């Protein structure tokens, strides 16, 4: 009968998904519409409030909105020009910089916001590009950058890995693996990946209303399972989510309108 208070350490197993609850889309009066995100560690001169949207090929600029204010109305602080061409599908912001796949390589930029300045590209050793390795609905999703409670994360695959998803821990500095797991998930039998507190977890549809988050695989061990947590897709097809481990929710994007859902996990 001795009681103790609910012990928590922050993280642990996904254990449930809420349902998705759609957030105000911000004004634009243009056509100009693209994905948005924020750091989840935010750095000065930024804050929590601070927001990144791409524009729209040859992708090159990002707008930023110091204000949540300002993003809401569609009227960017200070836009960036990028030295390269982006892979929008899998950028992340993360501790003050802009990470993303250079446009037709295999190549992770750091872009320095505050400075705009390239700090650091990396080589994926190995990593296909250019559809290659796509998810389960083609496109250009060969390698995906995330962020999660440890920091940063590159998925991918290899011609070595023969398609199975590969994952490596990247420094947010200067962009080298310091570890690197090799899946048995098929990388284009899921519809999208993300990590939450160092388990990858897969979508296993898009387009199916009522789908799930249908694998998991514990960097802690090594082991992969099977799931079966529902997981709603409500709109025109949601086209990336991202985790946000400072929020602690999913973020779907569907190329204009942005959803979030909420989670619980384990105290683990
Ligand atoms: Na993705």
């Known amino acids: 009968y001795l009681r103790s208070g609910e012990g ?17 889309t911000a004004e634009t009066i243009t056509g100009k519409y693209g994905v948005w995100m924020r750091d989840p560690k935010p750095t000065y001169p930024y804050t929590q409030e601070t927001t990144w949207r791409i524009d729209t090929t040859d992708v090159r600029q990002v707008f930023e909105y110091d204000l949540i204010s300002q993003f809401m109305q569609g009227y960017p602080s200070k836009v960036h020009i990028l030295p390269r061409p982006l892979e929008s599908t899998g ?5 003050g910089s802009l990470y993303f796949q250079g446009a037709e390589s295999r190549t992770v930029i750091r872009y320095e916001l505050n400075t705009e300045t390239v700090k650091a590209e990396k080589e994926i050793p190995g990593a296909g590009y250019h559809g290659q390795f796509p998810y389960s609905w083609g496109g250009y999703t060969d390698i995906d950058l995330a962020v999660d409670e440890a920091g940063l994360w590159v998925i991918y ?9 590969v994952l490596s821990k990247l420094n947010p500095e200067n962009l080298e693996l310091e570890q690197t797991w090799e899946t048995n998930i098929r990388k284009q ?74 989670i619980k996990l384990s105290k683990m």
Do not use: Q
Request: net charge negative; glycine share 6%.
């Open 8 to 24: 928590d350490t922050g993280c642990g197993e996904l254990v449930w998904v809420g349902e998705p609850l759609t957030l105000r």
């Open 91 to 95: 950028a992340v912001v993360y501790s």
């Open 157 to 165: 695959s290899t011609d070595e890995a023969k398609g199975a998803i």
């Open 189 to 262: 039998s899921v519809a999208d990946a993300f990590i939450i507190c160092g388990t990858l977890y897969t979508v296993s549809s898009y387009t199916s209303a009522d789908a799930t988050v249908n694998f998991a695989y514990d960097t802690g061990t090594g082991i992969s399972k099977t799931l079966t947590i529902p997981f709603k897709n409500r709109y025109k097809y949601s086209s990336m989510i991202h985790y946000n481990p400072l929020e602690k929710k999913l973020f779907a994007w569907d190329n204009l309108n942005m959803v979030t859902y909420d």
